[PDB]
Amino acid sequence: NALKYLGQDFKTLRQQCLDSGVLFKDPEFPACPSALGYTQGIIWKRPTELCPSPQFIVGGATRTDICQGGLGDCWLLAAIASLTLNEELLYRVVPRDQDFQENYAGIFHFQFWQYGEWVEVVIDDRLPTKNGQLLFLHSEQGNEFWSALLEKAYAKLNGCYEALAGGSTVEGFEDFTGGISEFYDLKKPPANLYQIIRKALCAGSLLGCSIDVYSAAEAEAITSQKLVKSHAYSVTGVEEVNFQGHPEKLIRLRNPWGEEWSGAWSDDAPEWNHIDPRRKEELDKKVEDGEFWMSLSDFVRQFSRLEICN
C-alpha cells in the first residue's frame, strides 16, 4: 500500500474539487517559477485549455509518446521509454483509469519508487507552455498528455523541472523496485554482451547507454554519424540477421528526442539490401522517430556504457 507524498490523497482531493465545481490547484507544487526551477513568456496551461478533447492515452502508452522538450532530462525520459516495454510495471507507475472526461477535476496521480517502497504523487494538470505549445515532454500525438503529466509528477518529487536535468537518475527512480543497477564498460565488454542484453529486454529490465565526453562544451554535441554525446539513449531491442555468410548481431536504440544514427544498419542504410528481404521488412522501419538499428560492433565503438536496471 503506497505512501501518500505530503499526505495528499488523489481520490479525496478529486472529490472535493468535483463537489466544489473547481479544478485542482496543487498547493504543494504551484504553477510558479519555483516549479520550473528558473524562458520568457512561459504560461501554465491545462490540456483542456490547449485542446478541445484532450486524451490521457491514445493508442496505448508507448515510447512513441516520449519526446524531450527544452529540458536536459534525457536519462529520465530514456528510462520512461524503456519502462513502456514492461507494460505491467508501466501501468503501476502510470494508473490507467485517468482521463479528461470522467471525474475530471484537473488532478492526476502517479506511483514512483523512493526509500524502498512505492510513493504516490498527486499533481494538477497545468503544464508549462510557450507559444501555445508544451515546453517540455510531449507525445508525437499532440492530443495525448500522459507523458507530459508523468514528467511533471517526477519534477514535483524532485523539487522542480530543472532538477530533472543532468543526472543519471532522479527521485522516484533510484534503485527502482529495489533492483540492481549494473554498468558495462563497452570498451572492455563481456563476450556474451548480446545474450545479456537479450535476457534483460525479455525480463522487462530497463536498458540505456551514453557516449562520454572530455569537455563540458562537447555535451549534447552531435557526431558526424548523428549520435548525440553525453545524452541518454534507450536500448529497445536486439536481433540477429545473416549478412555476408555469417550471423550479424544488431541492437536497437531510441533517442529520447524522438528524432538518428546515419551509419551501418541505419533506416535508409544499404546493408538491409544484403539480407533476407523478409528480415528487412520486419526490422528496417523507415521513420524519423529517434529509433534505429546499429550493429553490436558499431554500438561498442560509438558508446561508452551500457546500463541495465534489473
Site of interaction with its own copies (CB under 8 A): 6-7, 27-29, 33-34, 37-38, 114-117, 158-160, 162-163, 165-171, 174-175, 181-183, 185, 213-216, 305, 307
Least distance between its own copies and beta carbon 234 (Å): 17
* CB 13 within 8 Å of CB 28: no
Spatial contact of 139 and 148, defined as CB atoms under 8 Å apart: yes
Tell me whether residue 35 or residue 250 sits nearer to Ca ion (CB atom). 250
Residue ranges in 242-261 that form contacts with Ca ion under rule CB under 5 A: 260
Name the binder of 260 from its own copies, Ca ion, none, CB < 5-8 A by kind: Ca ion
By a kind-dependent CB cut-off of 5 to 8 A, residue 214 interacts, out of its own copies, Ca ion, none, with its own copies
Q: Is 192 a catalytic residue?
A: no
Catalytic: 74? yes
Q: Which is nearer to its own copies, 38 or 297 (CB)?
A: 38
Q: Which does 6 bind (CB under 5 to 8 A by kind): its own copies, Ca ion, none?
A: its own copies
CB of 66 vs Ca ion, minimal distance in Å = 10
Closest of 8, 20, 110 to residue 56, by C-alpha: 110
- How many whole angstroms separate alpha carbon 277 and alpha carbon 11? 53
Q: Does 99 bind Ca ion (CB under 5 A)?
A: no
- Which of residues 58, 127, 235, 250 is near Ca ion by CB under 5 A? 58
Which residue is associated with the grid cell 479544478?
A: 23
Minimum CB–partner distance for residue 232 and Ca ion (Å): 18
DSSP tag of 172: B
Give least dist CB 213 to its own copies, A: 7
Catalytic residue flag (residue 51): no
Residue 284 · residue 95 · CB < 8 Å: no
Spatial distance between the Cα atoms of 165 and 188, rounded to a whole number of angstroms: 29
Site membership for Ca ion, residue 267 (CB under 5 A): yes
Catalytic one of 17, 74, 209, 309: 74
Q: Residues with Cβ < 8 Å from 10, sequence gap 6 or more?
A: 107, 108, 109, 120, 122
Part of the chain binding Ca ion (CB under 5 A), chosen from 53-61, 90-98, 177-185, 209-217: 53-61
Least distance in angstroms from the C-beta of 92 to Ca ion: 18
CB of 162 to Ca ion, least distance (A): 27
Residue 258 zone, left/alpha/beta (φ > 0; ψ -120 to 50; rest): left
Active-site residue, from 138, 209, 231, 309: 231
Should residue 166 be labelled a site residue for Ca ion when binding is judged by CB under 5 A?
no
Residues 6+ apart with CB under 8 A from 79: 173, 206, 208, 232, 234, 309
CA distance 242 to 187: 25
Q: Are strands 133-134 and 181-185 parallel, antiparallel or unpaired?
A: unpaired
Segment 63 to 82, residues that bind Ca ion, using CB under 5 A: 65
C-alpha distances in angstroms, 195 versus 67, 68, 154, 239? 29, 30, 32, 10
Contact residues: Ca ion, CB under 5 A: 58-59, 62, 65, 260, 267, 287, 289, 291-292
Catalytic residues: 74, 231, 255
